[PDB]
Design an enzyme around this catalytic site. Structure first.
Site, PDB file in Angstrom:
ATOM      1  CB  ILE A  59      99.968  17.119  14.709  1.00 60.92           C
ATOM      2  CG1 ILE A  59     100.305  17.226  13.203  1.00 60.92           C
ATOM      3  CG2 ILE A  59     101.153  17.461  15.645  1.00 60.92           C
ATOM      4  CD1 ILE A  59     100.684  18.698  12.704  1.00 60.92           C
ATOM      5  CD  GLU A  89      92.618  20.009   8.237  1.00 58.94           C
ATOM      6  OE1 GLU A  89      92.165  19.178   7.436  1.00 58.94           O
ATOM      7  OE2 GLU A  89      92.135  20.212   9.393  1.00 58.94           O
ATOM      8  NE  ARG A 127      93.029  15.076   8.089  1.00 58.10           N
ATOM      9  CZ  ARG A 127      93.034  15.702   9.278  1.00 58.10           C
ATOM     10  NH1 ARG A 127      92.816  17.009   9.302  1.00 58.10           N
ATOM     11  NH2 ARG A 127      93.316  15.081  10.400  1.00 58.10           N
TER      12      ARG A 127
END
Ligand SMILES: CC(=O)N[C@@H]1[C@@H](O)[C@H](O[C@@H]2O[C@H](CO)[C@@H](O)[C@H](O)[C@@H]2O)[C@@H](CO)O[C@H]1O
Ligand code: NAG
Length: 246
Positions: free
Chosen positions: A71, A160, A163
């Site tokens: 970010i 996260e 991912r």
């Protein structure tokens, strides 16, 4: 762009957002059936905008670098905010240019710096969908200490989870009750760059990691990942950081 609304949100709608966020990141190749993020993207195309809405319908737009899911900053009303780091400053040349004012946050975006600013490590900060509603609310008006914690929640429940399938599932379990991240969650966050590198080096090495990645598992036990047949590679990791950026 992609969007997520906390009002009416459930595990299903959060899963749709995380799928949208993954599908918004460009790739030209998959490596062991996992999308390989691009080495570089020039200009404004290097930033995805995520529109997030709190339960009351107020919103921030978060700018995400599409090559590494980092970010860079966000817009809240007429004020833009960016991390204190060169990648973010570069992003500020391209996104939220129409903001009346631009504040540079007093820290970079790395976990260690954010934890310092927030006054607590990730292990002690509850995450979940209610925590994300709080984080959006907090970011709406500047408070750099409160924003550090909010950003630690925001990073984990967006980037996260994009991912790692396991982290997406952890947040879905926390749709209506926050809880600090499992030790496995922290482990995966910390190992993403390492994993991405080893999966890419396994091509040319018969699916075998040149260096084994150490992880904590679901039951809290510490495991060694040595090759692409591992559940971490076949069923968990969803995006690979290009070795050109490692
Ligand atoms: C996933 C996400 O959006 N953000 C964080 C990153 O901010 C962070 O990376 C670090 O911060 C910057 C690069 O953005 C750089 O100064 C650091 O050296 C470091 O790479 C990362 C690890 O703290 O966590 C990501 O999830
Ligand atoms: C690959 O990993 C599996 C566990 O997922 C392990 O049983 C196997 O021995 C490993 N093989 C190699 C060559 O690393």
């Amino acid at each position: 762009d992609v969007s997520f609304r906390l009002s009416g949100a459930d595990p299903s709608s959060y899963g749709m957002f995380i799928k949208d966020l993954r599908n918004a990141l460009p790739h030209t190749e998959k490596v062991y059936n996992i999308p390989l993020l691009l080495p570089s993207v020039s200009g404004a195309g290097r930033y995805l905008l995520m529109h997030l809405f709190n339960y009351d319908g107020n919103t921030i737009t978060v700018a995400v670098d599409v090559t590494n899911v980092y970010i860079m900053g966000y817009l809240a009303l007429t004020t833009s905010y960016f991390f204190n780091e060169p990648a973010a400053d570069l992003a500020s040349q391209y996104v939220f240019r129409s903001a009346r004012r631009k504040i540079t946050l007093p820290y970079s975006g790395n976990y260690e710096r954010l934890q310092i600013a927030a006054g607590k490590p990730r292990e002690k900060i509850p995450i979940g969908l209610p925590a994300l509603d709080t984080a959006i609310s907090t970011l709406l008006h500047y408070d750099s200490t409160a924003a550090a914690g909010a950003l630690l929640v925001l990073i984990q429940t967006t980037a996260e989870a994009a991912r790692f399938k396991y982290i997406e599932q952890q947040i879905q379990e926390r749709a209506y009750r926050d809880e600090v991240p499992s030790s496995a969650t922290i482990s995966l966050e910390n190992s993403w760059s390492g994993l991405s590198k080893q999966i890419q080096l396994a091509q040319g090495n018969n699916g075998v990691f040149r260096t084994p990645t150490v992880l904590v598992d679901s039951k809290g036990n510490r495991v060694q990942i040595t090759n692409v047949t591992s559940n971490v590679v076949t069923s968990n990791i969803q995006l690979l950081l290009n070795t050109k950026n490692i």
